[model samples]
Target: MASKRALVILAKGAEEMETVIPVDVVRRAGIKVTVAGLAGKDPVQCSRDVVICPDASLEDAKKEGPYDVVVLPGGNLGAQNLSESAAVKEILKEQENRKGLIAAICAGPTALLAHEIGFGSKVTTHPLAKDKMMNGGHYTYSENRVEKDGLILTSRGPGTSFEFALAIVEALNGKEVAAQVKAPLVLKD
Candidate 1:
């Protein structure tokens, strides 16, 4: 059987932990994750000085499609940079059309607005992006660690990436598998 592929979009200045944690958790669940850089060539740097080499460039990956899911990790500059990338926008647009799972955390959800992906969906983001999301005339706020509306799953920030990844695991695998993973981690909820 072919493994499910999860595409993680990484941009310069992305939150280090947010970008890595989900990838690790998902792979632990036996999913294949492809980390693509929004810009070609240069390695992406995280807020905490970690550097991630891209598996491929956004430009190249956009042509390949039907990934089981797409993940977006947030940092101020990184999220903004991803939001502005033509290739990233195109991939998101395609994913939205297909109703594929799109997971974002922190300011990552803010980037969705640029593609009109969250226009009328109830969503949540980093506290700092709250006002902007509310003013965007669409999303309803929530205080939970993970919020799912349709195919979109969003979380607060780095602190929530673990839960966010587990949520994706549940969505892709099943509640039982998610529970199993959580059991080993001693995670409640």
Candidate 2:
């Protein structure tokens, strides 16, 4: 069987854990994750100063994705950079129209808003952006660590990355496999 591929969009100054943790957890569940950087050949800098070489450029990944899901990690700079990428915007627009799962944590959803993908969708983001999200028109806010409404999932920040990733695992795989993955981590939900 073909693996379920997950495309993670990376940009400069991305929150290190938010990007890495989801990739780690989902891949542990047997999903294939491709980390794509928006700046083509440029290395991505994490918020913590670690740099990562992306699997491919965003333009290249655009032709490549009919990915089962797409994940966006948040850092103010990263989200801002991602929002400015035409290729990333187009990919997000297509994904949203197809109702494919799109997950964003913290300021990541702000990038989604730029792509016009979150109207009427329930979403959550960093507290700093909460009022901004609400002002944008039609998002229902939930104070939970992670919020899922239909094909969109949103997490607060690094503190919630594990639960956020596990939630996506459960949503895509099933409760049994998700639970099994969590058991070893001593995490229960």
Candidate 3:
């Protein structure tokens, strides 16, 4: 296993399921899941009105250094925040250079584009995000529920969050551990 730590960033209007499911599932596998607030340490309200308390601010989380994986949850507005943040750009750059795992779901993958990261890898995003993701056609897209191309792993949307998180666990912890984690959830094969 590389490291049992993960960073799941949260911003205003982030999809509740996409944010919570990955953090919840990865933590179930004993990974250290840091729910990071993008704007600040204050609680963030999801698009569906679910309020979430982040474990730390993104600024603070950056100081912790080199999490095993950095996850992005999909929400158009949330993605806009991520795509616009200079901090997020720097973090993604560092993770990409380190060859670390980065998982993004729904509109979350669009942030990667805004940051100009992962140009060669195939990715997937929510149907609504297709145009933005294909803006420059610098990268290719897949319709898979979850897509993993090298260090970059992406998924369609909320419906694929579990599959996405399990992919992260499997990458960092191995198939056995992922299986052990999956069995209890009674996930369909």
TM per candidate comes to 0.94, 0.94, 0.97
Best by TM-score: 3
Q: Between candidates 1 and 2, which one is better according to lDDT?
A: 2
Best by lDDT: 3
- Candidate 2, residues 8-43, lDDT tens digits: the string is 999998998999999989999999888998888578
Clashing pairs in 1: none
| TM-score preference between candidates 2 and 3, better one | 3
Candidate closer to the true structure by TM-score (higher is better), 1 or 2: 2
List where candidate 3 sits over 4 angstroms from the true fold.
1-3
**What tens-digit string does per-residue lDDT give for candidate 3 at 26-60?**
99999998899999899999999999999999999
lDDT of 1 by residue, 65-116 (tens): 6798999999988888878887777888888888899999998998888777
TM-score of 2: 0.94
Global CA lDDT computed for model 2: 0.87
Badly placed stretches (over 4 Å) of model 2 are: none
lDDT of 2 at 144: 87
Clashes per prediction? 0, 0, 0
- Model 1, stretches more than 4 Å misplaced? 186-189
